[PDB]
Amino acid sequence: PQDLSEALKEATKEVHTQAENAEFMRNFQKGQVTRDGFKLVMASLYHIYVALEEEIERNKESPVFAPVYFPEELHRKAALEQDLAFWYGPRWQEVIPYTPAMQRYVKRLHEVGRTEPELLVAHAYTRYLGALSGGQVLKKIAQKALDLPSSGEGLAFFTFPNIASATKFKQLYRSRMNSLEMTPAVRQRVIEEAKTAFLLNIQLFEELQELLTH
Ligand code: HEM
């Protein structure tokens, strides 16, 4: 399509369905998620966002990313830190898992941010616009399946406090993405990087499912 945001949505429809079909995601949707499984997911997210946000900060002023730099509205690291302290306890940093599949994703995020900056938008798009599109349904199924106490912690990651309206913000984020100037060659690389992001998530889901079924 014409708009980058429109191109991305179209090009990733296939892999997105693949992600929905992943065994781990299927069970999560079927309300079949265990606390051990959810903990692993949260640990994964922490590593992923730490890496992504480290690279976003590195390229914040670059013309290849600046247009989509929204630190206050989107940053998730602090929320995940809060959540992990609840899920793994006060010494969470020394006990949370960092698996090979998580490492593969983190490695690509750093490669992109350090040597292929123009593709970082593909990862920001996949993570942030994705969390803003179906994060409401995930949070719902989560709290209803984990039956956690009323301790007021554990799911901060699912709430973006600095965004008053998700619909309006997504419109703004899409507009900014479409404002980015890139050659047809780069545009193709960004589209392909978005598919790569989904694949990295899918391989992660597969690994997590394996770790939980021994
Ligand atoms: C449990 C599986 C999942 C479900 C049920 C789900 C559901 C949805 C829904 C309903 C939309 C469409 C929103 C709309 O346009 O009205 C959407 C969009 C999106 N999802 Fe997912 N999703 C899932 C997993 C993922 C994963 C694993 C990622 C990537 C890490 C992801 C990334 C995205 C992105 C980037 C969009 C934005 C599409 C656009 O540009 O409009 N989703 N998702």
Smallest Cα–Cα separation from 131: which of 75, 191, 81, 188?
75
Q: What is the resolution of this structure in A?
A: 1.6
d(CA 208, CA 191): 26
Domains: count for the chain: 1
d(CA 82, CA 74): 16
38 Cα–ligand 1 center, Å: 19
- Domain range for residue 7? 1-214
Tell me which of 16, 47, 139, 175 to substitute to probe ligand 1's pocket, judged by most ligand atoms within 8 Å of the beta carbon: 16
Residue with tokens 């599949």: 101
CATH number, position 213: 1.20.910.10
3-state percent breakdown (helix, strand, coil) of the chain, nearest 5: 75, 0, 25
Smallest Cα–Cα separation from 23: which of 207, 211, 206?
206
16 is in an annotated binding site: yes
9 is in an annotated binding site: yes
Elucidated via: X-ray
Looking from the CA of residue 202, the nearest atom of ligand 1 is 27
Residue with tokens 């994705």: 130
